Design an enzyme around this catalytic site. Structure first.
Site, PDB file in Angstrom:
ATOM      1  N   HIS A   1       0.796  -1.222   0.000  1.00  0.00           N
ATOM      2  CA  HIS A   1       0.000   0.000   0.000  1.00  0.00           C
ATOM      3  C   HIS A   1       0.829   1.274   0.000  1.00  0.00           C
ATOM      4  CE1 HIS A   1       0.693   0.704   4.372  1.00  0.00           C
ATOM      5  NE2 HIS A   1       0.708  -0.618   4.432  1.00  0.00           N
ATOM      6  N   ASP A   2       0.397   2.223  -0.830  1.00  0.00           N
ATOM      7  CA  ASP A   2       0.895   3.609  -0.817  1.00  0.00           C
ATOM      8  C   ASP A   2       2.296   3.779  -1.361  1.00  0.00           C
ATOM      9  OD1 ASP A   2      -1.538   4.626   0.506  1.00  0.00           O
ATOM     10  OD2 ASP A   2      -0.777   3.491   2.232  1.00  0.00           O
TER      11      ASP A   2
ATOM     12  N   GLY B   1       5.132  -0.627   3.121  1.00  0.00           N
ATOM     13  CA  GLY B   1       4.213   0.486   2.910  1.00  0.00           C
ATOM     14  C   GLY B   1       4.850   1.849   2.733  1.00  0.00           C
TER      15      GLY B   1
END
Lengths: 258, 258, 258
Positions: free
Chosen positions: B120-121, B138
């Protein structure tokens, strides 16, 4: 039925007797599957792969897929797998490149544990064990009766010879000679596979010769060629098993792990 | 047909011209697939993913799945993938979180080898190579022309800047500045990507400036801000390429790898 | 519908209320799936597996497959999974062996991130987090509230006790006692999980007792039995939480990480 109706099998594939193929498998073009081999569900055999007899391939293995080498330009290349291998979930075995010999080859009686990667142009012998998450990079040659501990990586062009053992979580950047125990990141030789060769039923005199050979190679300050001369002179005549060590040093391209 | 009849495609998906989708793929809601992209068999695109043109995604990749962050509470978030990427077997690319910018983004011309994880991200640029089993945690930002060696991990929030190289089996816990070679567990800087920048066709004077900058940053005992002042004064005026190093040090949140 | 028509479900399976099973899943014989559990697409549950309530299992997980132990000879063995677990893409969870207790067991509220491997005969408690690419080898026992950092490996027969933390990219070859922070390859103890126990709301006096216990175990030169005697004498009476450390040392088979 031995072949599930949801398998998709290229018309150019050839399937031997008593082959099992589970649901949702894909068998690509120019694949041959030998007698008694079992594919579970969800196996992809990309194409251009010869599989021998009595193999077992588990779900989510990618077998005989095109390689990852950026030099590859769509040339016809192959994967060969021998007999009686176990290829566990999430393995990836890739076809060769024309820059080498257009062939990735694995022998027989191997265990490839979950997420074993065999890169393009590797040559792997018989009776080897690759523990979970082992990455074998391009053009690597593995002998017989090798054990590679989990989460290890073997750098391109390395040679890992018979009866050697690679410790868990190792990064192998150079060759590992026959009988040698190597481990670490950075990855050093630590001795001869004494227990391994004792369990194979080898004599004390044989073992002692290999230990002396190890000292010549790793502890004496001699070059590979110089160590070979000493092994040939003093050890090889009564310890024919030392020839595998000589072969390792003579065949090395990347040098050896120390 | 270019789209196999066993693919399952959400009615809200949008598929461009000349897209190939193999057997047993799942295309979730709010997915867009750009022209010329090819999915092999057994690809899952979870949802909320924009894929550009001329990508190739191999079997058992999980693309645009919800993230692994325990803070995630079902919010609408996205994955974007650019053009001309290669996403190999067993990769996992996860959507963003609202705590950041609700977006994981990968650029163009990347090679994600088998079992690359993009958390994620993350924001990943162009022309990067992630070798097998690379884990990017992340909120990591990766620039362009980066090479990450196999079985490496990059800690959350780290920044890996352009033309850097991460050695195999490294654990990266801090930022890796532009042009820097970093490796190990623990993971140290070892020099400038000299061969890499020579192969990119850069002059000796440029290379020498970056080597001096490296010494200021890593060997002199200066803080990041102090090293920046020296690079600005003495190196940047004739070596505009040093600006990428300055940017690395100015943008760092976790500090840098030493 | 909650169960996709392309799932294949063995007639001997038993499926509870409100279970979701996505496309192209395989549910083998003697599988039970508890209420509220969700399988995404492309999940294989091999057989002989009991799954509790409110689990979520993502695509390309191999759940309850036969183990990788070469000693296994087709005996009936099992996997049990409790409630409220998250099993991410590419995990592999294997059934037990008769040489132990014919059972691999995972508890409740665990997060198994992408490519977590749980080998035969493991026993895992509750509220644990396994980061990406974690390999847990055979017969390993994990307590509760443990965090295992990404790309770590835990050697067969090791015991990783409650509230411990394993750093990213570690190779764990011996036991990790309760509350202990261990990391590296080679993998050393570095202290007590102070922040972890502070976040759990534990007092300073409790923390100080555990720090003294840590010093007795790791810094004093005492054997495990000798350290236990000191903890029992001086610390345990006012710090009942020290009993978990005593249990670790008393239960150890492989010795402990130092």
């Amino acid at each position: 039925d031995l072949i599930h109706s949801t398998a998709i099998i290229d018309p150019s594939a050839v399937i031997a007797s008593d082959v099992q193929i589970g649901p949702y498998c894909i068998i690509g073009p120019q694949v041959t599957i030998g007698a008694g081999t079992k594919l579970h569900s969800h196996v992809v055999v990309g194409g251009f792969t010869r599989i021998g007899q009595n193999n077992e391939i588990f779900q989510f293995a990618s077998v005989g897929e095109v390689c990852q080498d950026l030099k590859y330009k769509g040339e016809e290349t192959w994967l060969e797998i021998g007999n009686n291998n176990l290829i566990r979930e999430h393995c990836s075995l890739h076809r060769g490149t024309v820059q080498d010999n257009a062939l990735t080859k694995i022998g027989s009686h191997n265990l490839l544990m979950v997420n074993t990667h065999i890169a393009h142009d590797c040559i792997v012998g018989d009776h080897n064990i690759f523990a979970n998450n082992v990455g074998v990079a391009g053009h690597v040659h593995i002998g017989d009766h090798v054990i590679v501990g989990g989460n290890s990586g073997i750098h391109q062009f390395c040679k890992i010879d018979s009866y050697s053992m690679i410790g868990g979580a190792s990064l192998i950047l150079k060759d590992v000679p026959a009988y040698v125990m190597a481990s670490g990141n950075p990855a050093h030789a630590f001795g001869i596979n004494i227990e391994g060769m004792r369990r194979k039923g080898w004599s004390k005199n044989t073992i002692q010769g290999l230990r002396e050979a190890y000292k010549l190679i790793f502890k004496s300050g001699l070059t590979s060629v110089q160590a070979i001369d000493q092994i040939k002179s003093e050890i090889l005549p009564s310890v024919p098993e030392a020839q595998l060590l000589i072969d390792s040093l003579e065949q090395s391209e990347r040098g050896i792990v120390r």
